[PDB]
Specification:
The protein is largely without helices or strands and 70 residues long. The chain has a domain of 25 residues. It is 13% helix and 0% strand. It is built from 1 helix and no strands. The radius of gyration is 25 Å and the shape is elongated. This is Suppressor of cytokine signaling 5. Interacts with EGFR. Interacts with ELOB and ELOC; mediates EGFR ubiquitination and degradation. Interacts with IL4R; inhibits IL4 signaling. It is classed as signaling protein. The entry lists the keywords Suppressor of cytokine Signalling, JAK interaction region, Intrinsically unstructured protein, signaling protein.
């Protein structure tokens, strides 16, 4: 006969009601090459004075007034 078989009750308390399957949102991008001060710099691949560039001004940078996305 015996008692107090272990104690390991400080490592957390699980996460119930936080798992229900239906989990698949893969993504794909150019990561692991980006700067930390990049503001439109290297990103003007079109000539001056053509319609391709007027669309480019729409996106502008990594961030613009375009609605929330993620």
């Amino acid at each position: 006969r015996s008692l107090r078989q272990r104690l390991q009750d400080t490592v957390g308390l699980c996460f119930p009601m936080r798992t229900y399957s239906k989990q698949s949102k893969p993504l794909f991008s150019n990561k692991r090459k980006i700067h930390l001060s990049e503001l439109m710099l290297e990103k003007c691949p079109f000539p001056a004075g053509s319609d391709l560039a007027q669309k480019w001004h729409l996106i502008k940078q990594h961030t613009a007034p375009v609605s929330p996305h993620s």
